[PDB]
Amino acid sequence: FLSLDSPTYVLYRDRAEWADIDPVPQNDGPSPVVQIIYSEKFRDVYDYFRAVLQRDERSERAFKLTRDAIELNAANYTVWHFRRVLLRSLQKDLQEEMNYITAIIEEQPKNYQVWHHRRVLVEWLKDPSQELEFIADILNQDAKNYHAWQHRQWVIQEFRLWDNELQYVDQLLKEDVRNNSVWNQRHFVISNTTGYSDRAVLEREVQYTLEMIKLVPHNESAWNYLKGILQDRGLSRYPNLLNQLLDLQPSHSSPYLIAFLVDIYEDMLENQCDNKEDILNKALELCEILAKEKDTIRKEYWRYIGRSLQSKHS
C-alpha cells in the first residue's frame, strides 16, 4: 500500500498497526565482521521482517512487508521464500502476483530471484500465456539478458511453444547479427524441432551462415555457429567447404577464416585424406601465421595446435 519511496512513507516502528510487534534486530555477534551500516529504512524494515519470520506470522501485513524487504534487497532469497509461503497460505491471487513480478523484473532484470519467482508462479498457474511476450519486452531492453533467455528456453521446452521461435530468432538476428544469444537460441530451436540431420536443414543453415559471414566477415558468432553445426559429423565429411572458404580468403579474410581452415585440415589429417604430407604443412603454416601475425593474442594456443598436429601426423 504505502510505497517505499513515497514522500509520506513512515518507518515501521512509527506505525500504529505494528505497535503490538517488537522488532527483532540482527545479531552480528559481539565483534562484527563485514558489518553493513544499514540506513534507517533498511534496518527498520528487516528488524520487523525478522520479527514476522520468527513468529512465523502468516498475515496480510506480513505479506505487504515482504514487498518492502524485497525492494530493499531483491537478492534476499529468504524473504522470497517466506513470500511464497504467504502467497499459498493466504491464498493470494496469483495473477495479481504475476503483475507484481512483471514490474520488479522490469526494474531489476539482472537478478536470479525475480526470475525464479516468476517460474514458480507460471508453474503454479500452469499458464505460459504471457511469457513469450513478457520476455520479448525484457529482451527488447537488453537483447542478451542471460536470465531472460534461460526463462524463454524453459517456457518453450515445458509448454511446447516452438512454432514461432525460429521466426523470433530471425527478427533479432536481423536487429543484431552479432547477438551470440540469438545464435544460441537458433541452435536451441532447430535441434529440438527438426534437428541438423535433415540434409535440407543443414543445407539451409550453412548457406545462411556463410551468407551472414560474407556480410560481416569479422563477426565471430556466425563462424562459431558454422563450426558448431558441422564439427559434429566431422568437417572433412564436407569436401566442398574447404575450397569454398578459400574462395573468399583474398577478400572476406579474417583470422576467423584462417582458423576454420586449420580446423578443416586437422579433421582431414584425422580421417585418412589424400596427400597428408602437404596438408600437415598447410596446417602448420596457418598456425604459424596466426601465432606470429594474424592472431598473436592466442599464440600459446596456436603453437600448441601446431605441436600436437606434428606429434600425431609427422
Binding site: 540482527q26 565483534s31 553493513i36 551500516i37 532469497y77 514458480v120 552479432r178 592466442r298
Partner: protein
C-alpha cells in the same frame, strides 16, 4: 616492452565491416576507452610503470573486512561472500589475518550456519549453496582448528542431499533454482570437508556435460549460451569428481582461448560481449584446469612454461585498466570498485603470473617485481596450501555414515 603499447597492437582494434549493430558500437566504445589508458603515457610524456597498488588495496580490504557503508545493503544476503572475497584478496596480497580477526570471522560464520546444514547469507537466513561455498572457503583460508570445527559436517552432507535432483543436478537452495553453479558449490564443499558418499554425485558429471553446447563452453543449464562463470563451475566441478573426460575438452579449449580480447587483453564472459576484469579468473582460470586435464590424459604437446592464454596481456589489462587509485579493482575503466571484482581481478592476476605442471614452474611478472602475488589453486580459488591443509585435516574423520 609492453604488449598493449606496441604499434602493431593498433591493428587489433575492432573491424566492424562497416556494418554497425549494438554489439560493434558497444565494443568500439570500450575499446576507445581502453586505448586512452594505453596511450596516456605517450600522451603525458611519462615512461610507463605497471604497479599493483598493494597498500591502497590493503586499506580498502582491511576496512571492508570490518564494516561497510549502506552501499552494500544489496549484499546483506551475501556476507559469507564478502568474508571470502576479502580474506582471499588479502591472502593473495600476502597479508596476515590477525588471530582475533580470524576468530571473529569464525564466530560470524557460525551465526550464518543453518541448524539443518549449510550456511545462509547472514544470521538467521536460510541455507544456500553459494554462501555455503563462500563460508567453507573462508574458513579454509583461515585454516585453524577453530575454523574447521565451525562446519557441521553431518548436517552439511544432509543439506547437500536435500538439494540433489534425480537427473544429477542440485538446487541452489530449498525451493530454489538449479544451474551448474550448484554442482560446483556442492562438489567444492563436499570434497574439502570429506563428506562425499558413494552416491552423492551420482549423475552429476553427466548432467554437467549436458551443459556443454555447440560453442564448446558450458551454459547454466542444458541449452543455454556458453558463459565463463558457468564454464569454470562445470569444468572445476568435473575435476573434483575426476570426470573431466566427460567433456569435449578440445572444443572447450578452443572456446575459452577465443574469449580473450585481442585488443583489451582481458577476457569476455560470452562471445560478442565486453571484456571484464573478473573473468580474468573465470575464463583464464580454465587454462590451468585444461592443462592438468590434458596432461593426465597424457597430452605430449602441452607447454612446459606457460598456460594457453596470453599471460602478459591479461596482466597488462588488469594492471593498467582494473585498479582504482583509491584501492580495489574493477570490471573496466569507468566502472566502480567492489570486493567481488577486487577478489577475482587479483585471483586472475595470480593465475596469469604462475605456471606449474608437475615439476616445472615458471613465472611471469609484468611491471615491478613487487607485483607478484601468492599462488591460488585453480579449482577452489584459495591458497594451494590451504587446500592441502584442509583436505588433510578432514580426512582424519570418516565420511558421515
Amino acid at each position: 616492452p609492453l604488449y598493449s603499447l606496441r604499434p602493431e597492437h593498433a591493428r587489433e582494434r575492432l573491424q566492424d565491416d562497416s556494418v554497425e549493430t549494438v554489439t560493434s558500437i558497444e565494443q568500439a566504445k570500450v575499446e576507445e576507452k581502453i586505448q586512452e589508458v594505453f596511450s596516456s603515457y605517450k600522451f603525458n610524456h611519462l615512461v610507463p610503470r605497471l604497479v599493483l597498488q598493494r597498500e591502497k588495496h590493503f586499506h580498502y580490504l582491511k576496512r571492508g573486512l570490518r564494516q561497510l557503508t549502506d552501499a552494500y545493503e544489496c549484499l546483506d544476503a551475501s556476507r559469507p561472500w564478502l568474508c571470502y572475497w576479502i580474506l582471499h584478496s588479502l591472502e593473495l596480497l600476502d597479508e596476515p589475518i590477525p588471530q582475533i580477526v580470524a576468530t571473529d570471522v569464525c564466530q560470524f560464520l557460525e551465526l550464518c550456519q543453518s541448524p539443518d546444514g549449510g550456511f545462509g547469507g547472514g544470521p538467521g537466513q536460510y541455507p544456500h549453496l553459494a554462501p555455503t561455498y563462500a563460508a567453507v572457503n573462508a574458513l579454509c583460508i583461515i585454516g585453524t582448528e577453530e575454523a574447521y570445527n565451525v562446519i557441521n559436517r553431518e548436517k552439511l552432507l544432509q543439506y547437500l542431499y536435500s538439494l540433489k535432483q534425480p537427473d544429477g543436478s542440485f538446487l541452489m537452495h530449498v525451493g530454489g533454482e538449479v544451474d551448474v553453479r550448484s554442482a560446483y558449490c556442492a562438489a567444492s564443499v563436499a570434497s574439502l570437508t570429506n563428506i562425499i558418499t558413494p552416491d552423492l554425485f551420482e549423475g552429476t558429471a553427466e548432467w554437467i556435460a549436458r551443459c556443454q553446447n555447440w560453442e564448446g563452453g558450458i551454459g547454466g543449464v542444458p541449452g543455454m549460451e556458453a558463459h565463463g562463470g558457468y564454464t569454470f563451475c562445470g569444468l572445476a566441478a568435473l575435476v573434483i569428481l575426476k570426470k573431466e573426460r566427460s567433456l569435449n575438452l578440445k572444443s572447450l579449449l578452443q572456446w575459452v582461448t577465443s574469449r580473450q580480447m585481442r585488443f583489451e587483453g582481458g577476457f569476455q564472459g560470452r562471445c560478442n560481449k565486453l571484456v571484464d576484469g573478473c573473468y580474468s579468473f573465470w575464463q583464464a582460470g580454465l587454462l590451468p584446469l585444461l592443462h592438468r586435464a590434458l596432461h593426465a590424459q597424457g597430452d605430449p604437446a602441452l607447454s612446459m612454461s606457460h598456460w594457453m592464454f596470453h599471460q602478459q596481456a591479461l596482466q597488462e589489462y588488469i594492471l593498467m585498466c582494473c585498479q582504482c587509485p583509491a584501492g580495489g579493482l574493477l570490471d573496466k575503466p569507468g566502472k566502480s570498485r567492489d570486493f567481488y571484482h577486487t577478489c577475482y581481478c587479483l585471483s586472475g592476476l595470480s593465475i596469469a603470473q604462475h605456471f606449474g605442471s608437475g615439476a616445472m614452474l615458471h613465472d611471469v611478472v609484468m611491471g615491478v617485481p613487487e607485483n607478484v602475488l601468492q599462488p591460488t589453486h585453480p579449482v577452489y580459488n584459495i591458497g594451494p596450501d590451504k587446500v592441502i591443509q584442509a583436505t588433510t585435516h578432514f580426512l582424519q574423520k570418516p565420511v558421515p555414515g
